[PDB]
Subunit: 292 residues, 4 copies
Amino acid sequence: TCVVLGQNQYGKAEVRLVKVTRNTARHEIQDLNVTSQLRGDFEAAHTAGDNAHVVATDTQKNTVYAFARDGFATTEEFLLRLGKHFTEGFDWVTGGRWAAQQFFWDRINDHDHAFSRNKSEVRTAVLEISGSEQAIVAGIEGLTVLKSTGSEFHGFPRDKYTTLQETTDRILATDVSARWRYNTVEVDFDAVYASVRGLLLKAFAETHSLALQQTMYEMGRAVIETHPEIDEIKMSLPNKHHFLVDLQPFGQDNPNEVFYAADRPYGLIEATIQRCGSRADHPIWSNIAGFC
Amino acid sequence: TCVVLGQNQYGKAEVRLVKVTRNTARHEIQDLNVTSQLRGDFEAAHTAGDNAHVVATDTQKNTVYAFARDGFATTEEFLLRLGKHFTEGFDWVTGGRWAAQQFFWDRINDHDHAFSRNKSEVRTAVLEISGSEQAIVAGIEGLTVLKSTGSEFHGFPRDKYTTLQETTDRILATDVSARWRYNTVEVDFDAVYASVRGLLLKAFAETHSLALQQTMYEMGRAVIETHPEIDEIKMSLPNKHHFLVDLQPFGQDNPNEVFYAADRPYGLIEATIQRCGSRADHPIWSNIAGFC
Amino acid sequence: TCVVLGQNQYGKAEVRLVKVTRNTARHEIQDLNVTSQLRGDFEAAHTAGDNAHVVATDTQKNTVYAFARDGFATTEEFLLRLGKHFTEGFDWVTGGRWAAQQFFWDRINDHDHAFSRNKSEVRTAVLEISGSEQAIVAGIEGLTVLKSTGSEFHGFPRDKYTTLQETTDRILATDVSARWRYNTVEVDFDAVYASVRGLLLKAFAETHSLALQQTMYEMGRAVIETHPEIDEIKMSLPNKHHFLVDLQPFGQDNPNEVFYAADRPYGLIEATIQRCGSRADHPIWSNIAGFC
Amino acid sequence: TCVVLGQNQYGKAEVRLVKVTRNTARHEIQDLNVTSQLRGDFEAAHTAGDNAHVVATDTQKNTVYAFARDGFATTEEFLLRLGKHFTEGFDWVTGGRWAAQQFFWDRINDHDHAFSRNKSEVRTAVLEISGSEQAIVAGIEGLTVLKSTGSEFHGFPRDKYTTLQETTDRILATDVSARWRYNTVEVDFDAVYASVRGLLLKAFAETHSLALQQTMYEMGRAVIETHPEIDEIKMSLPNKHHFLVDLQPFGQDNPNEVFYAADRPYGLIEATIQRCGSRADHPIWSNIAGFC
């Protein structure tokens, strides 16, 4: 039997970094969960256990903290520095994947050095280097939203396994997971993150939803229309079901007030909204959620 | 050998409830995770499988939703109504434990019916009824806070196993878990919750910490001194370590800027702060964290 | 306003320890998650930030690993050594709480030094020292069991909020969480753990269940009747509902075959089975599930 | 600005299914977590809220349970039945992705209808249909393994950020996540699953590891050489670090006995092992870990 090494990558995952900026009395906090993985010629490491090409995962971790000493303006720019370092510093390293989760902190009553975690969303960044190409995908996850009315679902086809009732008034609730790919690295990454977040919240709240597919489409369209530097945005939105409870056996009516919030199962509506004519299949999406 | 049924309680746990208030166009959301457990004469249920006294856990669940239809001003008042219902409605039920987690929602851009989850803290309430006595413990959990300076740890004894270096400047980070026992049910539960939350944050931020014990003591003291309706407050604070990274092997210094945020192990500092002369060990605390 | 420090304890939680025994070619693995907390005179630590009495949590951790170097026959005996060390080594330490989770490993094809995790149960031990008294509570958690028939629930009272249908055939599924208190430290801890585990599984499987209360009672009774060294056993059993799916809308019957395994809500049935005349409320149970 | 709908899929995720086989005294349990997603012409659903093509996610769920009523020989054959149903039954549905997690149960003391969960591994299956082409990827996850010796790491390059010491004796521990793509569906999926699991464990245990890359390569080679029906296998192996504790400050040596099992960070070593001449990149892998 003939065996060959295919797609592979390796490194150090979930390096927890906190960078305190204390040049003045008003401190700043940058809180990251960083993953560094390299791609290139690692044939002999796999087939013979030859580690001559294996930049140690411990070394990748050390590089994260050493680079953090210098500071970094944004999460994306920190990842860009790491990826350029590894691809330019090792002849057999031809690319890789560097990703981070950014955790937000609010000041406690605007104190200089006292903070509380904002857990209501997590920011993400994924950078993939392939030779001279650098591709950045920023994102938001864990942002839970809900409309208590202004959502309908009707006109769907019915087969012998269809029992779902049509409705013109229902709760629509989801966890916004969204990732958007930049077509350039020359981006004001923090300002675009704040803008995209506001656009997604606005389009979710203000669209009269006939389907979560339609809501998601309007969210993506609002992003693409406002940001030339973004080629496409992907969203994965669970439909977190709120079932109207039958109170009639207890002698009561339920005028869209009392709901059971189910855990599982849940709708899972996923879509890509792209600028007309842009690249259909960027390679970064192949590993954006993981290798396997 | 002789065997006997000891302490027992039973019911339905984690009933997820959403109550929408839509009498006007400005909707309100109340989002709870409710547990109902009964105590009393359940001997024959255990020793013989005689279910004559076993009010069904399904029935307790149904009662949660049916009662929710009427509305409720606060989480505590809803639990009080449930506990009164079960203890007065069944002769063999002498008490129980009713608990809820309250999840907070903010409006999206002040919209009437569009909301986003505030995940940065979870409110709790536990009500225990014993005969004619009832006790309420309110609480907060999941609130993560951090001081980037203004924390010291020195003067600790040094035994054969002590290697930690004294310091006058370190990060102090914790997850605030706090539960306080009311001495009366005549409380503005929402206003006291908001007050206690603010007091805990303020005392954490403003105390120059020589020990996490001291910070916690000042937090509890601020609560007790401001709220006559509270007899005691228990806190459990992990010390979520942020280790100063050694960058000297790389030719760099680390002036309290670059930190490794460790997962485990962690310090766990726990204390009770009480009003002088108040009850020493109320029974409600014995099962506040669970039965076993 | 007069404030006083009440019950308090502090230490290092979740110290992950792996002890390899390699005196011979056949290696052994002991895999523990250890928590060490001290009790005594810590007044000045809380009220003034005086750390003269504060044995550092880092020191407690170091003590765990240093003691592990000597080896230990069982988890309980390792906790006993730690607790005796801290209570005898510091005049102001009068007691404390030491706990561990033991994770089980199986050999891979009976190899000397290659193992795979047995994740189907986690063993627990909690030791509390109070002056000269040493109290040990051993336990099992995470053991999920299911009977596909041989379970009934009928004869329960019906109020206006009761809609549950009686049944003579249903699935009974639970997560066994069980903790038993020894009345002596002179115990063959591994052999009793193996016995108790077998007794609980046997009583679950072989009891024709008219109620989860009855099943739980029989499980505890088998333990108490077999083990003179155990005074009492507490169980907390979720009723993990498997709902019989209604397939009649699709033209099909469902003869107890197709089920929906719900996440929440769930029954939560909790009880104590004790040897007649034994102590009613040992203080260790007050903190067995946590401080607050 | 012109906007276009790109890649999209939708359906019902995490349908928890338990199928009891009880036509005779010896009951069998099949315990699945099933996800169904459709692909095809859903343009008007997104751009206009026209649901004429939207087979309801509730309907996909109902189909899971109705089909389960007939029984199914393996998880893969159940997914194949679902995918064939949806792609043939709706003209505008051109394909999709159906996935399942299978949870294993063991008998309690060989009882006919009493079981306990085997939590030590989770089986997975993913089926993708595109037009007339289909592909099945089976897998295993959550299987934790450990070698206490027989692992080395040396010969790696040393840059300015490298501090790791070479070693010839260390612990190697990982969580086996492995997914293999079949080149035909005419197979005994249960027998191949058991075979692959055994081969992976054996190759992990018996390879003298000079690198986790090498161990992973040998595990994949062992699978490819014995299974002509498999074209390729992907693995993602964390290096779950067990650090040799420094006991020298305590006057003790540590001859590879006492280890600290760290949570994060960890090595993450990922590779594909393919049969020579087989398809280099199969589209099923682009979404195998999620959409985004």
